[PDB]
A paper describes a structure:
ATP13A2 belongs to the orphan P5B adenosine triphosphatases (ATPase) family and has been established as a lysosomal polyamine exporter to maintain the normal function of lysosomes and mitochondria. Here, using single-particle cryo-EM, we present the structures of full-length human ATP13A2 in three distinct conformations including an E1 state (apo), an E1P-ADP state with ATP and Mg2+, and an E2-Pi state with SPM, phosphatidic acid (PA), and phosphatidylinositol(3,5)bisphosphate [PI(3,5)P2]. The structure of the human ATP13A2 adopts the typical P-type ATPase fold with overall dimensions of 125 Å × 75 Å × 70 Å, including ten transmembrane (TM) helices and three conserved cytoplasmic domains [N (nucleotide-binding) domain; A (actuator) domain; and P (phosphorylation) domain]. In addition, the P5B type ATP13A2 also comprises two specific domains: a C-terminal extension domain (CTD) laying close to the P-domain and an N-terminal domain (NTD) preceding the A domain showing amphipathic feature.
To investigate the conformational change of ATP13A2 during the phosphorylation process, we solved two intermediate state structures, a 3.3 Å resolution E1 state and a 3.0 Å E1P-ADP state. Both of these two maps show well-resolved density. ATP binds to ATP13A2 and the resultant phosphoryl transfer reaction induces the rearrangement of the N domain, by which the N domain tilt around 30° to lay close to the A and P domain, thus sealing the crevice formed by the N and P domain compared to the E1 state. Notably, in our E1 state and E1P-ADP state structures, this cavity is nearly closed which prevents the binding and passage of substrate. The binding of ATP and Mg2+ induces the proximal arrangement of the N domain, by which the N domain tilt around 30° to lay close to the A and P domain, resulting in the E1-to-(E1-ATP) transition. Release of the Pi forms the intermediate E2 state, in which the cavity towards cytosol is open, thus allowing the translocation of SPM to the cytosol side. The A-domain should move back to the original position after the release of SPM to the cytosol, the protein then adopts the E1 conformation, ready to initiate another transport cycle.
Author numbering: 60 to 71, 113 to 125, 140 to 360, 365 to 582, 610 to 613, 620 to 696, 708 to 779, 784 to 796, ...
Write the structure that this text describes.
Amino acid sequence: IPLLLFRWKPLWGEGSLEPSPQSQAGAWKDTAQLHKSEEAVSVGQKRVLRYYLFQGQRYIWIETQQAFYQVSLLDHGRSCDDVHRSRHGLSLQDQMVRKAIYGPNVISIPVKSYPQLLVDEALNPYYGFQAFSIALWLADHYYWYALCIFLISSISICLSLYKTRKQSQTLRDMVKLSMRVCVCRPGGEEEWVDSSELVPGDCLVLPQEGGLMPCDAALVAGECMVNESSLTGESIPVLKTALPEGCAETHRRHTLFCGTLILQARAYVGPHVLAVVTRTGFCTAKGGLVSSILHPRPINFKFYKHSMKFVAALSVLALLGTIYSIFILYRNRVPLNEIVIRALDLVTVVVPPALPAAMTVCTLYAQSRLRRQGIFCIHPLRINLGGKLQLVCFDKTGTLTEDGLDVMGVVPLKGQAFLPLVPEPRRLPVGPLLRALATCHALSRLQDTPVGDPMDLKMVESTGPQLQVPVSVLHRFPFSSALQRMSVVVAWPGATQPEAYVKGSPELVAGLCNPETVPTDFAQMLQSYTAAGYRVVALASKPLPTRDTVEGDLSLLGLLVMRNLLKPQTTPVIQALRRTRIRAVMVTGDNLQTAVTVARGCGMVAPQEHLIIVHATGQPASLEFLPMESSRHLALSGPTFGIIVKHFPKLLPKVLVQGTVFARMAPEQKTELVCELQKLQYCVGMCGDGANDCGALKAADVGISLSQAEASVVSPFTSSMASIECVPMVIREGRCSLDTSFSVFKYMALYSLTQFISVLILYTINTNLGDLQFLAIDLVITTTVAVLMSRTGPALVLGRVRPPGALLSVPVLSSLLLQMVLVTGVQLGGYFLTLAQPWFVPLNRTVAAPDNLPNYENTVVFSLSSFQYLILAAAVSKGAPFRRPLYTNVPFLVALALLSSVLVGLVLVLLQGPLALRNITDTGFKLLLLGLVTLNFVGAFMLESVLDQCLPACSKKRFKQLERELAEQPWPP
């Protein structure tokens, strides 16, 4: 083999592909087009048996003849007749043959124990640089400073251990489905096998009492009632029917997904129900969503996008900083054994150890602020995407309107008089119409919940009679979608003859009713509700003294009115997004005439703002642009949106920039409306609720789901308040986390730089900063005010000003430099003020640098510098546009106050044996050392309250450029 390139590697992956060449040359090699590293095979079970798991799917492909990839969907072209032939169980000898091809039917999480996980964190070139720094400063004997950068790099690791062991504990909780499952064998058995031995091609008999689900099986025989709350959040009971003979992604009403909980499971044909296993652990629903979490898409928040700028600047400060060290120390007559070490020591102060510890902890407080409010996020780095959102798409029903249809009242008809809509249906007396709305229902009085059609259960408590004077006699015609109506014959004690109640649409039923009974103003009465967003149904009766005699020659009695109201917290939120100039889009799959009358109510289309319906044609002709008379908006449609994206590709960005109401959108069309806005360089958000949004919540940059405790059908922000008032809370938290991450970074840099400058102003005169001084500084002062810096919080009102989004920009480099100038003109303003004192004596220069110098040239530099760090933390931590004022952070004022008081003490009145300061500065020189700290405290607040008020006189996003064109000339004629 001669593969021992390991010996070569001992000497030491930026270029893995390059590295790969070294390792090897029809086995164990796989370049999977993304980092190209997945080497696995098993070759067991007396076959070829390719094995490799690339993200958890098995890919049985070692060749082209007797192998084929994608264990998911390798038997996807089945027929509906074929699964009925699999009603019998697989053979027990053949049952342990399909387990080789498929998985063990367990979506598994590795344990990743503590020796295996500490090695995956410390193996990086930014903890190995500091392990070099442990053995670098410890060449100067028995340092305390070589202990602190071990003790604050054991906080940097242990916080990265905590955010990993708590994220993987969350994913391991939701996929725990330990249950013993009864099946059928090849010939008349049960055998009660474990759920970790189920393969597709097996039967499955459901328990009628209780149990969740083993795996997504097709309901081949029987009736079942499930609870889909684990997979979609729509927690209403869904009735599952038996699969007819003659497509698993199409027949949703015949599949029992893995994770949903089954409730009734009645048989009605035989002794029990039957199912046919289709998928397994990593290739199911709830197995595909978890595999989309633990291998996420890369986030489009390029934090430190420049990637070379900081590194090259680092290079210049380090080198043009370390060649000043080699120029001044060599003019101090050194024996060359330590110049090298002094320079490496100068390079180790420009890399702060607590930089990964303060950027990690800045995100743990962000998840700790959203969990108090309700939003449960799991991907920690997608918090910062909420600060950068120019666009938010909404669903309609359940999201910013009510969940189900709600009744308004009754419009009766007593002799064609058109008596108006009553506000409360509990107020009309009992008759043929009041008995009508309480008995024509396809519900079921089972387990104390009326379960059935969501519409007619709402009119049960609209008046509230008793249920289970009328009695359920017979359902003469079931409510079918083909004939659209439902006839129920009812009787009651005290009747001469039973009546026949039937409900349906207004137009189709009145065309079958008596023409002498339906009036002439029936079309405009239908028109006055179908154009305002009302859903209206009619009802009829006929007394009976079978066939369709129950539905014929009917009297028109009255109208029933249903209407989806807005939520009370919808209107102040849509106005608060329009006021802060982020654009609001509604993406619904409901009717178009309903969607316009809602988008005028909530506030996408404000009054005195025109909108025009496009309504393109299926033919390749023009767009027709119908107007509406009741900025500039456009209202699209479902089949309209397919015409522009196919036949008019040059006119597509002119529509998505100024189109607001998208109606009749298919659930597979909600996902490329998001992927097309991301190609206009929007950063799209998506608040949604249901199964229709499962493709579009993932594709969005911030996908938010409503009204669920802790689920995974979201991208990540499942919240739990059932309103759209959480979508400003993600904007308002993602903005106070995007500049806090900037304020933490531009403080670490400011500290490293003040230290490089105090070790460099002390390398001249050969008076290097002490032992407990480096420790003090770092640990105490710079880690207390960096772990506690990021606890402030979000503001209370959003604003028009976005965060700057780019770290190394022109307002950041300038402040750092000006602040550095104020910092170096005060250490030089403190060093050259002791030198003019009468009590001043110099240092014994020719002894060593760290050995025997408790002198006056470090006492002034350590005192001035300690305060510089505390001043700078407070200066860089501002919260006027985005975060909050810093006095609300009570554990951050107590740091500053306590640390400042200790520091003022060690300069006025000890820690003089320790920290090696000069014994007593005798005269009243102490009182004006606090003088030029005060004009550093004043001179830093009055420097960043001026520099952020700077406008340099001298549309990056694609959409912004288009908007400018629209402003100059409206695109519609």
